[PDB]
Amino acid sequence: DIQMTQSPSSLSASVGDTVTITCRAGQTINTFLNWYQQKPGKAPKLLIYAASTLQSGVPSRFSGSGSGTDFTLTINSLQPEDFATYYCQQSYSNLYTFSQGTKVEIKRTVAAPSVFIFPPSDEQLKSGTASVVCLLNNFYPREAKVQWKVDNALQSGNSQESVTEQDSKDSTYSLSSTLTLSKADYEKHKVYACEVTHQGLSSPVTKSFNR
Amino acid sequence: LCPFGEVFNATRFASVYAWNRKRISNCVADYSVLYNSASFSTFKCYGFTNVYADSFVIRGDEVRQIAPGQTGKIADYNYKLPDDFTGCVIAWNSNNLDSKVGGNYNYLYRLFRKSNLKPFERDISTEIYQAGSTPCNGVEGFNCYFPLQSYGFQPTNGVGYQPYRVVVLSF
Ligand SMILES: *[C@@H]1O[C@H](CO)[C@@H](O)[C@H](O)[C@H]1NC(C)=O
């Protein structure tokens, strides 16, 4: 089996708000629907059971409800902490089921990244390879943009980004972009620059160095 | 205006030994999708104040035991009805739901008990029985068994050993 469709898939809302998550079902259930909260870096947490049951450890700012095939977790007085992925569940008479997920990001005022560039360590160059790591720190929204320019030509093939999960404290993100060349390719260019475009920036931002 | 529907369409039923009871007060009943509904192995009625919907799952050939003055594992040790009983026992086969390869472990019954159950009594304790002589002090094996047991409902089972969902209206 009995499939469950949670929606919306992503939800961005500011502190103190009231959010409402839905879960349409292939068929019907009763004291057998239950909601879960997976915070990042963390196992799942049961929030509501037997449809509307308050649970234990969870506060009364969380509340569930539903009939037949449509069910609804709602949080009120949204808090930074609350951001996570939320999951439906159904129970038995053949078959167990959750849903896709629903990610709840916590909207806030735009914060521009603090960019920081690290050139390759001597240790690494000895071992054959060069890595230049650009670091965008504490920003919102996610939706940022990094480019590597090398002797001013836009490099494409050989970088990889990694953004962190939203941070409960300041509801920001951080991100690394990492350009990896072989030592031999690395020595065929002089200037290495990291250009950035966030909504929080008036004009783009570069941090660059020389080999 | 009365519910029933919440009782009948219940996604999963109780184990017989912890049989579930929903209270029904303030209203009259329509009927229809009871009685005029077929798909019931049984629809037996015997013999208002206030009405009790008592739901649970048993085997096929235990259903005869959900009647006044009946005996056996269920009537004795899991769900007793009074002789007095004015009410309805409604049952239906649910193999397509409550049976699993392995043996759906969700349905249990009380195997052994010191005495019989009173009408409409429900015992949920799991203190080990003590069949022999020795004091058990919580363990089991040599005599001294554990009191509940699984129906282990599997698709291949004959009807005699298949899951039947039983609703017991009582007046
Ligand atoms: C069961 O029946 C009740 C009452 O007729 C109805 O409101 C409900 O939607 C039905 N289904 C479930 C899963 O409760």
Q: Give how far the C-alpha of residue A203 lies from the chain's centroid of Cα atoms, to the nearest Å.
A: 25
Same domain, B149 and B113: yes
Paired residues of A97 in beta bridges: A90
Same domain, B125 and B86: no
The two three-digit tokens of residue B85, written as one number? 């009983």
What distance in Å separates the CA atoms of residue B139 and residue A97, rounded to the nearest whole number? 37
Q: Which of A26, A124, A17, A119 is nearest to A69 (CA)?
A: A26
Containing B51, the helix (H) or strand (E) segment is strand B51-58
Paired residues of B60 in beta bridges: none
Contact A98, A74 (CB under 8 A): no
Q: Which of A97, A79, A81, A67 is nearest to A6 (CA)?
A: A97
Which among B6, B12, B94 is the nearest to A91, CB-wise?
A: B12
Ligand 1 atom closest to Cα of residue A29: 13
Q: Which amino acid is at A177?
A: S
Task: Give me the number of domains chain B comprises.
Answer: 2
Calculate Rg over the CA atoms of chain A. 23
How many other C-beta atoms can be found within 10 angstroms of the C-beta atom of residue A185?
13
Q: Which amino acid is at A160?
A: Q
Q: Which of B24, B30, B76, B74 is nearest to B54 (CA)?
A: B24
Domain enclosing residue B114, as ranges: 103-154
Paired residues of B54 in beta bridges: B21, B168
Same domain, B68 and B137: no
Same domain, B162 and B82: yes
Q: Which of B151, B110, B144, B140 is nearest to B129 (CA)?
A: B144
Which among B6, B11, B96 is the nearest to A32, CB-wise?
A: B11
- Name the interface residues of B facing A (CB cutoff 8 Å): 6, 9-12, 94, 96-98, 100, 106
How many other C-beta atoms can be found within 10 angstroms of the C-beta atom of residue B84?
10
What distance in Å separates the CA atoms of residue A87 and residue A64, rounded to the nearest whole number? 12
- Contacts with B, A 24-43, CB within 8 Å: 28-32
Q: Which of A105, A173, A171, A170 is nearest to A139 (CA)?
A: A173
Same domain, B74 and B142: no
Same domain, B67 and B45: yes
Same domain, B93 and B113: no
Same domain, B121 and B166: no
Residue A67 Cβ inside 6 Å of ligand 1? The answer reads yes
Same domain, B54 and B18: yes
| Residue-range domains of chain A with CATH | 4-106 (2.60.40.10), 114-210 (2.60.40.10)
- Which whole-number Å values give the CA distances from B73 to B6, B80, B92, in the listed order? 28, 10, 20
Same domain, B164 and B82: yes
Size of interface A-B (CB pairs under 8 A): 25
* Overall size of chain A counted in residues: 211
Experimental method: X-ray
- C-alpha atoms less than 13 angstroms from C-alpha of B155 in its C-beta half-sphere: 6
What distance in Å separates the CA atoms of residue A48 and residue A32, rounded to the nearest whole number? 11
What distance in Å separates the CA atoms of residue A209 and residue A174, rounded to the nearest whole number? 22
In degrees and rounded to multiples of 5, residue B79 shows phi and psi of -160, 105
Place of tokens 């090398």: A150
Q: Which residue of A has its CA nearest to B10?
A: A30
- Which whole-number Å values give the CA distances from A62 to A39, A46, A49, A98, in the listed order? 15, 11, 12, 19
What distance in Å separates the CA atoms of residue A134 and residue B158, rounded to the nearest whole number? 69
What distance in Å separates the CA atoms of residue B99 and residue B105, rounded to the nearest whole number? 9
Same domain, B38 and B120: no
Containing A125, the helix (H) or strand (E) segment is helix A122-126
What distance in Å separates the CA atoms of residue B77 and residue A192, rounded to the nearest whole number? 81
In a mutational test of the A interface, the residue from B4, B7, B12 whose CB has the highest number of chain A CBs within 10 Å is B12
Contact B166, B44 (CB under 8 A): no
What distance in Å separates the CA atoms of residue B112 and residue B62, rounded to the nearest whole number? 16
Residue numbers in B near A30 (CB within 8 A) = 6, 9-11
Enumerate the H helices of chain B as residue ranges. 5-8, 73-77, 95-98
Same domain, B125 and B57: no
Give every CB contact of residue B5 below 8 A, 6+ residues apart in sequence: none
Give every CB contact of residue A17 below 8 A, 6+ residues apart in sequence: A76, A78
What distance in Å separates the CA atoms of residue A131 and residue A118, rounded to the nearest whole number? 9
Query: Positive or negative, the Cα torsion across A173, A174, A176, A177?
Result: positive
Label residue A48 exposed, middle or buried (CB < 10 Å: 0-12, 13-18, 19+). Answer: buried
Q: Give how far the C-alpha of residue A167 lies from the chain's centroid of Cα atoms, to the nearest Å.
A: 9
